[PDB]
Amino acid sequence: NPTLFVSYDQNGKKLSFANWISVLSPQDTPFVSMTGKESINQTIFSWQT
Amino acid sequence: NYGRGRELMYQLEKKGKEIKRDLEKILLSGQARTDVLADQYLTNSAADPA
Amino acid sequence: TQMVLRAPKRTELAKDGSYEKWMIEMEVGLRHRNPYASGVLFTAAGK
């Protein structure tokens, strides 16, 4: 059927992906990027006022 | 919570002590070769295929 | 302030057979010096 040396519609082609993946999940965390943590030992803590 | 050591060893050593106590009590009290291969034990016949 | 108990650490669980389960746990806690120190405002309709 083909008679003009066509290369665009051949069977058994490759895929040629981008080699990378995109991701837009923001992780700015302003309220966490501010003043840090304080480690504890038990599950319950307390403070006075 | 900022503790200096929190491991299961506290319970594991207790379990080891209890196991030693059980070994002491069990080797002398009442266990006498429970009848697991009785009915002519000498007739195991290649691991008692029963 | 943010009170933390155990930092986030990778952990493995039973295999179960071809499942290959994985887990991530993190223990955190919040703290505030005084309730009346910081304020809050809820939106709402007008007049």
**Torsion angle in degrees (nearest 10) through CA of B18, B24, B30, B36:** 80
Q: Are A41 and C29 spatial neighbours (Cβ–Cβ below 8 Å)?
A: no
Q: Which two tokens stand for residue B24?
A: 């002491």
Q: If we measure between CA atoms, which residue out of B1, C11, B3 comes closest to residue A37?
A: B1
Q: Which two tokens stand for residue C10?
A: 């990778």
**Resolution at which this structure was determined, Å:** 4.0
C31·A45 Cβ contact <8 A: yes
Q: CA-CA distance, B1 to A46, in Å (whole number)?
A: 12
Q: CA-CA distance, B1 to C6, in Å (whole number)?
A: 7
Q: CA-CA distance, B12 to B14, in Å (whole number)?
A: 5
Instruction: List Cα–Cα distances, A26 to A23, A33, C7, in angstroms.
Output: 9, 13, 21
Give the DSSP letter string of A16-43: ---SS---------HHHHSS-EEE-SSS
Q: Residue A40: its chain B contacts at CB < 8 A?
A: 1-2
Residue B42 has phi, psi (to 5 degrees) of: -60, -15
Residue A47 has phi, psi (to 5 degrees) of: -150, 160
